[PDB]
Design an enzyme around this catalytic site. Structure first.
Site, mmCIF file in Angstrom:
data_model
loop_
_atom_site.group_PDB
_atom_site.id
_atom_site.type_symbol
_atom_site.label_atom_id
_atom_site.label_comp_id
_atom_site.label_asym_id
_atom_site.label_seq_id
_atom_site.Cartn_x
_atom_site.Cartn_y
_atom_site.Cartn_z
ATOM 1 N N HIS D 53 0.809 -1.217 0.000
ATOM 2 C CA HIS D 53 0.000 0.000 0.000
ATOM 3 C C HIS D 53 0.843 1.268 0.000
ATOM 4 C CE1 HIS D 53 -3.070 -2.920 1.156
ATOM 5 N NE2 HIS D 53 -2.341 -3.229 2.213
ATOM 6 N N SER D 76 1.737 -0.468 -5.465
ATOM 7 C CA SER D 76 0.803 -0.747 -4.386
ATOM 8 C C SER D 76 0.251 -2.164 -4.511
ATOM 9 C CB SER D 76 -0.344 0.264 -4.389
ATOM 10 O OG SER D 76 -1.242 0.011 -3.321
ATOM 11 N N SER D 81 -5.694 1.714 -2.123
ATOM 12 C CA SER D 81 -4.962 1.999 -0.897
ATOM 13 C C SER D 81 -3.937 3.119 -1.029
ATOM 14 C CB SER D 81 -4.250 0.735 -0.411
ATOM 15 O OG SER D 81 -3.390 0.226 -1.416
ATOM 16 N N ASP D 131 3.174 -7.638 0.230
ATOM 17 C CA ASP D 131 2.062 -7.526 1.177
ATOM 18 C C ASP D 131 0.839 -8.127 0.490
ATOM 19 O OD1 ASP D 131 0.011 -6.902 2.920
ATOM 20 O OD2 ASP D 131 0.586 -4.803 3.178
ATOM 21 N N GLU D 156 4.270 -9.227 4.415
ATOM 22 C CA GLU D 156 3.735 -8.346 5.447
ATOM 23 C C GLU D 156 2.575 -8.981 6.209
ATOM 24 O OE1 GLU D 156 4.874 -5.478 6.423
ATOM 25 O OE2 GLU D 156 3.241 -4.467 7.482
ATOM 26 N N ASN D 181 4.668 -10.824 9.528
ATOM 27 C CA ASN D 181 3.378 -10.655 10.190
ATOM 28 C C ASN D 181 3.422 -11.128 11.640
ATOM 29 O OD1 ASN D 181 0.286 -10.201 9.965
ATOM 30 N ND2 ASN D 181 0.430 -12.328 10.671
ATOM 31 N N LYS D 186 4.184 -6.645 15.213
ATOM 32 C CA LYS D 186 3.408 -6.530 13.984
ATOM 33 C C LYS D 186 2.003 -7.081 14.206
ATOM 34 C CE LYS D 186 1.865 -6.733 9.698
ATOM 35 N NZ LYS D 186 0.566 -7.331 9.267
ATOM 36 N N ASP D 190 -0.122 -4.017 14.585
ATOM 37 C CA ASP D 190 -0.684 -3.660 13.287
ATOM 38 C C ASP D 190 -2.074 -4.262 13.112
ATOM 39 O OD1 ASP D 190 -1.392 -4.248 10.452
ATOM 40 O OD2 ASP D 190 0.507 -3.269 9.973
ATOM 41 N N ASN D 191 -2.171 -5.593 13.180
ATOM 42 C CA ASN D 191 -3.425 -6.252 12.829
ATOM 43 C C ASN D 191 -4.548 -5.895 13.797
ATOM 44 O OD1 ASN D 191 -1.177 -7.482 11.559
ATOM 45 N ND2 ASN D 191 -2.295 -9.407 11.252
ATOM 46 N N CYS D 195 -6.485 -1.718 13.125
ATOM 47 C CA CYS D 195 -7.883 -1.742 12.710
ATOM 48 C C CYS D 195 -8.784 -1.069 13.737
ATOM 49 C CB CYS D 195 -8.334 -3.181 12.460
ATOM 50 S SG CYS D 195 -7.485 -3.981 11.071
ATOM 51 N N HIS D 315 -7.873 -8.802 3.572
ATOM 52 C CA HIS D 315 -6.955 -8.359 2.524
ATOM 53 C C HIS D 315 -7.605 -8.381 1.142
ATOM 54 C CE1 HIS D 315 -2.987 -7.587 0.717
ATOM 55 N NE2 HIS D 315 -3.393 -8.410 -0.234
ATOM 56 N N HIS D 374 -3.692 2.300 8.716
ATOM 57 C CA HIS D 374 -3.166 2.394 10.069
ATOM 58 C C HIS D 374 -2.370 3.685 10.260
ATOM 59 C CE1 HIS D 374 -4.674 -1.511 10.222
ATOM 60 N NE2 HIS D 374 -3.570 -2.230 10.319
ATOM 61 N N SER D 382 5.504 -2.367 12.366
ATOM 62 C CA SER D 382 5.522 -3.307 11.249
ATOM 63 C C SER D 382 6.724 -3.068 10.348
ATOM 64 C CB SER D 382 4.229 -3.185 10.444
ATOM 65 O OG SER D 382 3.103 -3.233 11.296
ATOM 66 N N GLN D 386 10.093 -5.063 8.887
ATOM 67 C CA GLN D 386 10.386 -5.248 7.468
ATOM 68 C C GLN D 386 11.837 -4.915 7.150
ATOM 69 O OE1 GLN D 386 9.197 -6.468 4.813
ATOM 70 N NE2 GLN D 386 6.960 -6.646 4.959
HETATM 71 N N1 LIG Z 1 -6.907 -4.055 6.439
HETATM 72 C C1 LIG Z 1 -5.859 -4.122 7.252
HETATM 73 O O1 LIG Z 1 -5.304 -3.113 7.713
HETATM 74 C C2 LIG Z 1 -5.309 -5.482 7.575
HETATM 75 C C3 LIG Z 1 -4.255 -5.639 8.466
HETATM 76 C C4 LIG Z 1 -3.765 -6.901 8.742
HETATM 77 C C5 LIG Z 1 -4.329 -7.994 8.130
HETATM 78 N N2 LIG Z 1 -5.357 -7.825 7.276
HETATM 79 C C6 LIG Z 1 -5.985 -8.987 6.620
HETATM 80 O O2 LIG Z 1 -7.141 -9.331 7.338
HETATM 81 C C7 LIG Z 1 -7.321 -10.767 7.306
HETATM 82 C C8 LIG Z 1 -7.358 -11.313 8.712
HETATM 83 O O3 LIG Z 1 -6.062 -11.160 9.331
HETATM 84 P P1 LIG Z 1 -5.800 -11.648 10.826
HETATM 85 O O4 LIG Z 1 -4.406 -11.326 11.209
HETATM 86 O O5 LIG Z 1 -6.911 -11.149 11.666
HETATM 87 O O6 LIG Z 1 -5.927 -13.234 10.678
HETATM 88 P P2 LIG Z 1 -6.377 -14.346 11.727
HETATM 89 O O7 LIG Z 1 -5.992 -15.693 11.246
HETATM 90 O O8 LIG Z 1 -5.689 -14.040 13.059
HETATM 91 O O9 LIG Z 1 -7.967 -14.113 11.942
HETATM 92 C C9 LIG Z 1 -8.965 -14.549 10.995
HETATM 93 C C10 LIG Z 1 -10.078 -15.171 11.794
HETATM 94 O O10 LIG Z 1 -11.229 -15.395 10.955
HETATM 95 C C11 LIG Z 1 -11.889 -16.542 11.438
HETATM 96 N N3 LIG Z 1 -12.768 -17.048 10.391
HETATM 97 C C12 LIG Z 1 -12.406 -17.743 9.267
HETATM 98 N N4 LIG Z 1 -13.412 -18.078 8.496
HETATM 99 C C13 LIG Z 1 -14.518 -17.570 9.162
HETATM 100 C C14 LIG Z 1 -15.895 -17.596 8.870
HETATM 101 N N5 LIG Z 1 -16.418 -18.204 7.802
HETATM 102 N N6 LIG Z 1 -16.733 -16.987 9.739
HETATM 103 C C15 LIG Z 1 -16.218 -16.402 10.825
HETATM 104 N N7 LIG Z 1 -14.941 -16.320 11.209
HETATM 105 C C16 LIG Z 1 -14.136 -16.927 10.328
HETATM 106 C C17 LIG Z 1 -10.770 -17.493 11.846
HETATM 107 O O11 LIG Z 1 -11.228 -18.432 12.812
HETATM 108 C C18 LIG Z 1 -9.734 -16.523 12.438
HETATM 109 O O12 LIG Z 1 -9.818 -16.448 13.857
HETATM 110 C C19 LIG Z 1 -6.199 -11.304 6.415
HETATM 111 O O13 LIG Z 1 -6.644 -11.362 5.064
HETATM 112 C C20 LIG Z 1 -5.114 -10.241 6.585
HETATM 113 O O14 LIG Z 1 -4.183 -10.237 5.509
HETATM 114 C C21 LIG Z 1 -5.855 -6.607 6.991
HETATM 115 N N1 LIG Z 2 -1.132 2.977 6.549
HETATM 116 C C1 LIG Z 2 -0.729 1.811 6.030
HETATM 117 N N2 LIG Z 2 0.334 1.796 5.199
HETATM 118 C C2 LIG Z 2 0.736 0.627 4.683
HETATM 119 N N3 LIG Z 2 0.226 -0.591 4.872
HETATM 120 C C3 LIG Z 2 -0.827 -0.545 5.704
HETATM 121 N N4 LIG Z 2 -1.604 -1.598 6.129
HETATM 122 C C4 LIG Z 2 -2.546 -1.058 6.957
HETATM 123 N N5 LIG Z 2 -2.443 0.243 7.099
HETATM 124 C C5 LIG Z 2 -1.357 0.579 6.309
HETATM 125 K K LIG Z 3 -2.345 6.482 7.858
#
Ligand SMILES: NC(=O)c1ccc[n+]([C@@H]2O[C@H](COP(=O)([O-])OP(=O)(O)OC[C@H]3O[C@@H](n4cnc5c(N)ncnc54)[C@H](O)[C@@H]3O)[C@@H](O)[C@H]2O)c1
Ligand SMILES: Nc1ncnc2[nH]cnc12
Ligand SMILES: [K+]
Ligand SMILES: NC(=O)c1ccc[n+]([C@@H]2O[C@H](COP(=O)([O-])OP(=O)(O)OC[C@H]3O[C@@H](n4cnc5c(N)ncnc54)[C@H](O)[C@@H]3O)[C@@H](O)[C@H]2O)c1
Ligand SMILES: NC(=O)c1ccc[n+]([C@@H]2O[C@H](COP(=O)([O-])OP(=O)(O)OC[C@H]3O[C@@H](n4cnc5c(N)ncnc54)[C@H](O)[C@@H]3O)[C@@H](O)[C@H]2O)c1
Ligand SMILES: NC(=O)c1ccc[n+]([C@@H]2O[C@H](COP(=O)([O-])OP(=O)(O)OC[C@H]3O[C@@H](n4cnc5c(N)ncnc54)[C@H](O)[C@@H]3O)[C@@H](O)[C@H]2O)c1
Ligand SMILES: Nc1ncnc2[nH]cnc12
Ligand SMILES: [K+]
Ligand SMILES: [K+]
Ligand SMILES: [K+]
Lengths: 461, 462, 462, 461
Positions: D53, D76, D81, D131, D156, D181, D186, D190-191, D195, D315, D374, D382, D386
Site C-alpha cells: 500500500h 501498491s 490503498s 504484502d 507483510e 506478520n 506486527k 498492526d493487525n 484496525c 486483505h 493504520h 511493522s 520489514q
Molecule cells: N486491512 C488491514 O489493515 C489489515 C491488516 C492486517 C491484516 N489484514 C488482513 O485481514 C485478514 C485477517 O487477518 P488476521 O491477522 O486477523 O488473521 P487471523 O488468522 O488471526 O484471523 C482470521 C479469523 O477469521 C476466522 N474465520 C475464518 N473463516 C470464518 C468464517 N467463515 N466466519 C467467521 N470467522 C471466520 C478465523 O477463525 C480466524 O480467527 C487477512 O486477510 C489479513 O491479511 C488486513
Molecule cells: N497505513 C498503512 N500503510 C501501509 N500498509 C498498511 N496496512 C494497513 N495500514 C497501512
Molecule cells: K495512515
C-alpha cells in the site's frame, strides 16, 4: 451504664470503630463540615430523628450531627441494610440506635418507634432526617402533634421526595422539607456512580457469578438505571435497557445499549401472550431500578431463562412480584439473602432441579442487602448535603413561626447551587483534583462570579 | 437556470449533495416525521426565515423541511470552515438562496450574512430568525434594527448564542422573543455531548492521521461538550486529563475516571510564565478547548506545550485559543487546508525539518466542522427537530403583530415543553429500533404521571 | 459412617457447600460435559491423585469430577488463605480426604500437604499429582523421592509452578513428566486474564469497600494477570499506570491506553532510596503486583507510597511485596481478617488515629482468593476441564511402568493438543449461548484447515 | 529528467513531503533503524521489488531502505490503498513507483509489471518485499527465472504468509521468506490496534453515519476481528461476533460480545432457509475480517436490514460476494469508494428507493480504501520489522548458495524475539513510557538475562 439502644451484637463496636476511622479518611466533605462548624455549634439544641440504612457511612453522618451539637435517635430504613458493626460502634458511643441486619417487618416498625418514644413518651424532637419517607409517614399519621415542634425534614432518596411532593400537593405536609436527593453532589453521584460501584459488587458477593458475556436486562434508565447499567456493562455484560421515558431511552441508545420492552409493542396488558418470551428466555440477570411498582411481574418471572438472577436496587421490594413467588414457588435458601426460587411447585423442591431463579436480598435493596451499599467517598457527598440541609432548616426555625408565616415558608426545596458546588469542591480535593480559577476577564466573559455559582439553575450537568 | 440568487463554491456539486441528502433523510426520522406530520397543514406558510448555521448536509435537511412546511428562507453559514460545499450546491440548485462555502475569509463571512439580510440591495421582508451562535441576531439588532419590527421570534441553536440572548434580555436590548433550542434534552444532552463524542476524534484523524491510543490529552472544560470530547479521546485509548472551573463538573470528571488538573500551579492564572505547570504541559500531546470562554489556552500555555503537540478548539469561537499570539510571533506552515504547523523558532520562515512546532487544526475554529463534517445526521435529527418545532411555535405566536401589553408578556427566552422533547426523543429511539414500554394505569398513578407523559418534573436533570 | 480422614474448619458447613457446588455445576459446562462423557469409561480407575490447589467451590467440582471418573484423591490447598470452608466441608462430608481451611499458619499449611502424602503414618500409594504453584511437587522431589517412582505425571496449574518445572527439567532433577496446564489458551488467556479482571476489584471492594473511580492505581506487570488486573481497575474508573520489564508487554499497555511508568527514576533499581520516583509513588492510591517475580514492590517503594494507600498482591507468592520489611519496622493493626493497617510511625505500638499507614490485603498473599473467592466458576470451567484432560492423558500413558531407558525418552513438559483446547472452548461458548459457525468444505480448503479443526497453527498467539 | 514512474499528480509531492516529515516524527523504531544502520549500508547492492500500500507510512519505509543502500521499484498491493501525495513525493525523490488511488484491475497488474521490468527487460532484482503475495505470485508463475537471483521475500500480512506456507508445503516456493506478520510488534499491534484506529475512521469518512446505538456484526475474531470489534464497540455500537474458531469465540464472549452465526445453528447449507433472517434483519453494519472466502454471502446480502453498511477489512474483496451484487443489483455511486446497492433490480434504480445496501470501497480493504489505513505510530512497528527482515535475508545470500545449503534454508521464518523486543522498546519510548530494568537477583529469579529476551518463544502475549 447506657442501655437506650438495641443492636445485633455490641461486641462488634471495636470492629465498627476501626472502619469508622477509615471511613472518615474517605469522607473529606463530611469531615470538613466538622472542622468548619465545630466552633459555632449550629445544631446546638437540635433533636434529630434519623431513619436511614445503619451503615458505616451513616455512622460518620450521625457523629457529624452530634459533633455539631445535635442529639439523635436512629433506626434503619431497610431490614437488610444495617451493618451490625456500625450499629454496635454507634451504640457504644452512647447514641440511641435500633437496627440490625435481617430484621422482620415487626422489628422494623418497632425500631422506628424506639426513635419516636423515649421512655414511653414522644421525644422532644425538632428535626427529621429520613430516607424513603417511612419515618415521615408514621409521624404525619400516628404522631401529628410532634410535627408542631419540628422545624423541617431532610429526605435522602427519590422515593421519599415523591411522597413529600404528594403531601405538598395535597396540603397535608406539616413541616417544610429539603430535597437532599436533587443536589447534583447527591443525585448524579449517589444514585448513579454509587450503584455503578455497588451493584456488581452485591451480585458477586451473592452468587460469585461471572458476569462477562452474559445477558442482562435493566428495568429503568434514570440515575439508578444509568449507574446500574454501567455497573454491568463495564463487567462485560450484554446489557439491554427498558424504559417508559423516551428521553431516558434515548440516552440508553446513545450510551450504547439496546432498548427493549418486556412486552410485545411495549404494551403490558397483564397476559402471558404480551411477554416477549424469546427475549426473556435469553436473560441471565434482571435488575429493577424504577421506584415504580411491579416492573418485574409474574409473567416476566415465569418466562425468565432458567437459573437467572433477579434482584432489585430500587428503594422498595414491590418492583418485583415477590408476593407471587412466595405463594406459588418453593424457596431454597442458599445463604443469608440468597434464595433459589424453584418454579416446579410450592410443595417442596428437588435439590437438583434445574428450573429455578436466584433472588437476592428477597427483592430488597440488593446493593445494601447483599453487600455494603455505596462506598464512603460517594456517601460523603450525600451526607455533606444532609448536614447542610439539617442546619439550613434548623437555623430557619419554622416551628417557631406564626401560622400566617408558616404558609409562606412551607415548601420542598433543594439546597442552593452555592452549597452544591462547595460540597463538590471538597470531593474533588479528595481525589487530588485541582480546580482552575477564572480570571476576572473570563468571569465577565461568561457572566459569572469568580467564586460561583458557575451555572444557571436550569443547568442539568 | 434563471435563478442566480446565491453564491457557493461549485454549483456542479449539487448532484453529489442531493445523493447525500437522500441518505441523511433516512438517518433523521424525527425531522422527516415532522415533515410528514405538517406537510398538509403548511404551518410555516408566510414565514420568511433568515438562517445562519453551518451549511452541512444535516442543515440542508433542516432547510428543506422548513421549505416543505411552506416557509421561504435565506441561508448562510455561521462559520467560515464548516460548510459542506456539496450541501450548499444542492440547496442552491433547489432554488433556495444560500451564501456559504468552505474556507471563507472574515470579510466574505460578513458578506454572506448580509446577502441573506438584503435582497436586491434592500432589506428582505423577514419575519423569523434561526441562528447558531448569535452572529446574525447581533447584526440585526445593531445594523438593521428596523427589520426586527416585523420578526416574530428567534430560534437559537447553541449555548454561546443563548448566553448572548440572555444578556440582551437582561439589558432590555432584545427586541423579539427567543426559544432556547439548545436546552432541550434531545439537543443539549444529545447534540452537544454525543455529537462531539462522534466528531472530535473524527476531525483529528482526518487532519493529522495521528494515533491517539497511549498519548496524553488535556481537555479544557467538562460541560456537555467537554464530556463528549473527553469520551471521544478516552474511548480511543488516550490518557485524558480534565481542567475545569466548575467543581461540580470537576466532580463528574473524577467519577468518570479522569484526573482533574489545572494548567496553572494551584489553578491560579496570574498571567506570568511562572504560573504555568510546565511539567504538566510538557507532557501533553493534544489539548482541546470546550469552554465557550476566552483565552483558556493562552500564550504561555502554548509556549509550554510539548513539541509537536496538537491544538484544537471545539467551542463555538476561536478566541478560546490565543491564535493571535501565534500569528504575531510564530511562523505558520500549511500542511494541508485547515492544518498548520506553527513553528515556535521564529516568525520569518522556518526549517522545513524543524522539530519545535505545534499542529493547529482549523486555525482554532470548530475543529469537528472545520476538519470533518460535524455531528452525524442521526444526532442532528434531534437538534433540528427541536428547531422546526421552535420555528412553528414562534411563527404561530405572531409576536410582531401582538398588542404592546401582550408583547411585554411574551418578550422572553423560553424552552420547548417537555412533552415535545419526549416526542422528539421517541422518534429518535424508534430510529434505533428501540421499544419504549407503556405504563399501566396503576403504574402511572403510582409515580404520579400520565400514561402519555410527561414522565419527569421540569426540575429533572436526566 | 465413621469417616475421619480429613481436617477442615467446620464440618457443619457441608450442606451450605453442597448447595453452592450444585450451583457451580450449572456454571461449568465444559467440566460437567467431561463428567458425563467419561463416567461410564472410568478412565481414572486406579488413579491415586495427590492434589494441592485452592480448596474453593470450583476446586470441589474438579475434585468430584476426578472421583466421578474413577480416581481416589487426597487434597490440600496451595495457599493459606484461599480455602472456602464450606467447600472443604462439603468435600470432607462426601468421604474425600481433604486437609484445608481458611487462615492456616505456615506450619499448618505444610502439615496439610503431608497429610495427603501420608496415609496412616506411611506414604500413600500415589500415582498422580495435581499441583498449583509447585509446593507439593517440590516436597515430593525433596522429601519423598521414592514416591515419585510410582507416579505417572504432574498436571501443573499456574505460571509460577510451570517455571519451577522447567528449572528442574533443565537441571535434570525432574523425576516424572508434566503437562503444562497453564499454557492452554482456555486457561492462560481465560483464567489468568479474565479471572483477575473479575476477582481483583471484587477482593478490594470486600476488604476495604473503597471507591475506586477517580483514584490512582499502579499495576506492576502486564502479563496475562497484569492485563486482566489493569482492566479490573480501569473498568471501575481508576487512572491506571503500568510498570513492566518486558518492552513488548509494555507496548501493549501503551496501545491499551495506559501510561507506562517505572517506580524508579529512569527504571534503574539501584537499591537506594534515592532511585525511587517519590513524586509518582506519592500519588498512588493502590498498588498491585502481578509479576511472579521477587520484591517488585520493595521496601523503598513502600516508604514512598501515598498515605492510606492499599497494597495487595495477585501473583502466586507473597514475596512480590517486601512484607518482611513491614513486619520488622512497622506496627500491624488488624481491621478484620485478611485486612491490616500498617502504621509507618514505628514498630512498638501505634496511635489509633494515626494517618500515616498503608492497608495491606491478605498479608500480601493472593488477594483475589484471600479477600474474595478467586475466579468465578464459569472461568475456572476452562482451567479445570484442561486439568481433567491432562490427568487422563498422563495416567493413561503410564510413565512409571516404563523401563529406565524408555522413561528418559518420555521425560518432558508438554501442553495439551490444540484440538482439545478448541473443544474446551466450544463448550465454554455454548455455556454463554454463543453459536460457532461451521466452515463450508470450500472455505476450509481455502484457508487450509479441516472443517472440524484445528483452525490455527501451533504458532498462533490469539 | 526522471520519468521512471507513474503517479496520479506529481504536483502533490510537496504536500506528500510535508506529511512524510511528520510521519518520521511518529515512527521512532523505523527512524532509529535508519540512523543505526546508515553507516554500515547493509542493503548496498539490494535491488528490492516492493509491493505494498503506497501510503505515507510506506514512504518512510521506502526511504529507509534506500538510505541503507538499496535500490527499489515500487507498486501498491491494492487499487484503492495508495495515497496520491505519498506516491508523488516518492517519485519526486527519483524512486521508481507506479501507483495511484483508484486503479483498474488492468492498471494494477501494469503497475507491478512496471517494477518487474526495466526498459522492457527483467530488472536484476534480488530482494522482494510483498504484502498479500500478489508480487510473489506473479514472480513465481510469470518470471521464474528472476527468482534464481532473488535472495528472499519479506511478507507483510496474514494472507500472504498463508500463501507462502502453501507453496512451501507443495514444493513450489523457490526462495526463502521471512514472516514479518507474526512478529508481536506486527501481528498484535498492526493487525489489532491498527484496525481499532482505522475501521471506524473509514466508516465515518465514507458514510458519516452515527455508530452509537446501532447493531453491528463482525465476521471473525482474529487479530483484525478483535481490533475491528473494539473499533465499533468503543463508539457505542452493539457488536455481535461470528467465528468458526471456538477459542476465538471464547475470547469474544469474555470480551463482552454476543457470539452469533449468520446461519441457523451455524450450519451454512447454501439455501436461504439456513439464513437467520431475524438476526440479519436487525444488523446495521457488517464487517468481514477473516481472510476467508464468501463469509458474507449472497443469501446474507439478501437478508440484511435495509440500508445496512457492508464493508471488508480483510486483505481480499472476495470475503463478500460482490460478484453476485454486480450481477443482480444496480450500483449507484454516492462518491468515490461509496456505492448504494439497490436490491430492487439490475436495470436501473429509483433515486429515492429505500431498499439498498451501502458498499464501501467495492469490497476492498475499507480502512485503506475509505481512509488512510493504520496510523504512522502503529506502522512504525511493522515496518521496523520489514527493514530488519530485508537486512537479514539479503545478508544470507540464498541465491548464491549451493543446492544442499539451499535446502537447509528454504524456509519461512520469523524474526528473533530479541529483535521483536528491541522494536517494542523504541515504540514504548515513543509514548514516553519508561521500562523498568530487572535487578541481577530478579533476572536470576525468573531465569532471564537483564537484557532479555524476557519470554520464551511459546509465550502468546
Ligand atoms: N486491512 C488491514 O489493515 C489489515 C491488516 C492486517 C491484516 N489484514 C488482513 O485481514 C485478514 C485477517 O487477518 P488476521 O491477522 O486477523 O488473521 P487471523 O488468522 O488471526 O484471523 C482470521 C479469523 O477469521 C476466522 N474465520 C475464518 N473463516 C470464518 C468464517 N467463515 N466466519 C467467521 N470467522 C471466520 C478465523 O477463525 C480466524 O480467527 C487477512 O486477510 C489479513 O491479511 C488486513
Ligand atoms: N497505513 C498503512 N500503510 C501501509 N500498509 C498498511 N496496512 C494497513 N495500514 C497501512
Ligand atoms: K495512515
Ligand atoms: N439502592 C440505592 O443505592 C439507591 C440510590 C438512590 C435511589 N434509589 C432508589 O431507586 C429508585 C429510582 O431512583 P432514581 O433516582 O433512579 O429515579 P429516576 O426517576 O431518576 O429513575 C427511575 C426511572 O424508571 C423509569 N421507569 C418507571 N417505571 C418504569 C417501568 N414500568 N418500566 C421501565 N422504566 C420505568 C422512569 O421513566 C425513570 O426514568 C428510587 O426508588 C430510589 O429511592 C436506590
Ligand atoms: N462544535 C460543536 O459541535 C459544538 C456543539 C455544541 C456546542 N458547542 C460550543 O461549545 C461550547 C461549550 O458548550 P457546552 O454546551 O458544553 O457549554 P457548558 O457550559 O455546558 O460547558 C462549558 C464548560 O467550560 C467550563 N469552563 C469555562 N471557563 C473555563 C476555564 N477557564 N477553564 C476550565 N473550564 C472552564 C465551564 O465551567 C463549563 O462547565 C459553546 O461555545 C458551544 O457553542 C460546540
Ligand atoms: N491470583 C490468580 O488468580 C492467578 C492466576 C494466574 C496466575 N497467577 C500468578 O500470577 C503471576 C503472573 O502470572 P502471569 O500468567 O501473568 O505471568 P506472565 O509471565 O504472563 O506475567 C508476568 C509479567 O511480569 C513482568 N515482570 C517481571 N518482573 C517485573 C518487574 N520487576 N517489574 C515489572 N514487571 C515485571 C514480566 O515481564 C511479565 O510480563 C504468576 O505467579 C502466576 O502463578 C495468579
Ligand atoms: N476459584 C478458584 N479455584 C481454584 N483455583 C483458583 N485460582 C484462581 N481462582 C481459583
Ligand atoms: K459501603
Ligand atoms: K455530518
Ligand atoms: K469463586
Amino acid at each position: 451504664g447506657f442501655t437506650d439502644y438495641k443492636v445485633a451484637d455490641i461486641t462488634l463496636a471495636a470492629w465498627g470503630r476501626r472502619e469508622l476511622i477509615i471511613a472518615e479518611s474517605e469522607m473529606p466533605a463530611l469531615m470538613g463540615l466538622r472542622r468548619k462548624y465545630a466552633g459555632q455549634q449550629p445544631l446546638k439544641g437540635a433533636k434529630i430523628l434519623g431513619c436511614i440504612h445503619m451503615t458505616i457511612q451513616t455512622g460518620v453522618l450521625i457523629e457529624t450531627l452530634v459533633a455539631l451539637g445535635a442529639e439523635v435517635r436512629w433506626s434503619s430504613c431497610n431490614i437488610f441494610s444495617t451493618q451490625d458493626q456500625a450499629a454496635a460502634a454507634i451504640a457504644a458511643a452512647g447514641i440511641p440506635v435500633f437496627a440490625w441486619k435481617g430484621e422482620t417487618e415487626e422489628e422494623y416498625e418497632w425500631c422506628i418507634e424506639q426513635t419516636i418514644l423515649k421512655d414511653g413518651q414522644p421525644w422532644d424532637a425538632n428535626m427529621v432526617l429520613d430516607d424513603g419517607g417511612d419515618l415521615t409517614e408514621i409521624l404525619h399519621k400516628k404522631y401529628p402533634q410532634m410535627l408542631e415542634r419540628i422545624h423541617g425534614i431532610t429526605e435522602e432518596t427519590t422515593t421519599g421526595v415523591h411522597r413529600l411532593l404528594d403531601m405538598l400537593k395535597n396540603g397535608t405536609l406539616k413541616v417544610p422539607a429539603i430535597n437532599v436527593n436533587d443536589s447534583v453532589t447527591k443525585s448524579k453521584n449517589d444514585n448513579k456512580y454509587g450503584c455503578r460501584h455497588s451493584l456488581n459488587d452485591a451480585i458477586k458477593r451473592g452468587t460469585d457469578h461471572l458476569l462477562s458475556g452474559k445477558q442482562a436486562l435493566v428495568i429503568g434508565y434514570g440515575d439508578v438505571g444509568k449507574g446500574s447499567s454501567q455497573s454491568l456493562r463495564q463487567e462485560g455484560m450484554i446489557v439491554k435497557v427498558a424504559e417508559v421515558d423516551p428521553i431516558c431511552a434515548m440516552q440508553a441508545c446513545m450510551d450504547g445499549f439496546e432498548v427493549v420492552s418486556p412486552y410485545k409493542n411495549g404494551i403490558n396488558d397483564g397476559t402471558e401472550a404480551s411477554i416477549d418470551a424469546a427475549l426473556l428466555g435469553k436473560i441471565d440477570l434482571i435488575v429493577t431500578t424504577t421506584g415504580n411498582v411491579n416492573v418485574c411481574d409474574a409473567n416476566m418471572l415465569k418466562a425468565l431463562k432458567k437459573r437467572a438472577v433477579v434482584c432489585n436496587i430500587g428503594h422498595f421490594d414491590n418492583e418485583i412480584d415477590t408476593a407471587f413467588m412466595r405463594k406459588n414457588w418453593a424457596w431454597e435458601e442458599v445463604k443469608p439473602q440468597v434464595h433459589k426460587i424453584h418454579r416446579t411447585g410450592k410443595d417442596g423442591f428437588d435439590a437438583h432441579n434445574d428450573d429455578y431463579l436466584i433472588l437476592l436480598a428477597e427483592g430488597r435493596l440488593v446493593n445494601l442487602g447483599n453487600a455494603t451499599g455505596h462506598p464512603s467517598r460517594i456517601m460523603d457527598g450525600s451526607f455533606a448535603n444532609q448536614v447542610l440541609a439539617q442546619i439550613h432548616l434548623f437555623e430557619q426555625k419554622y416551628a417557631d413561626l406564626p401560622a400566617a408565616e408558616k404558609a409562606k415558608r412551607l415548601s420542598v426545596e433543594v439546597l442552593p447551587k452555592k452549597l452544591d458546588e462547595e460540597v463538590a469542591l471538597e470531593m474533588v480535593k479528595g481525589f487530588g483534583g485541582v480546580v482552575t480559577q477564572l480570571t476576572p476577564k473570563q468571569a465577565e466573559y461568561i457572566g459569572v462570579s469568580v467564586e460561583g455559582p458557575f451555572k444557571p439553575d436550569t443547568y442539568r450537568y
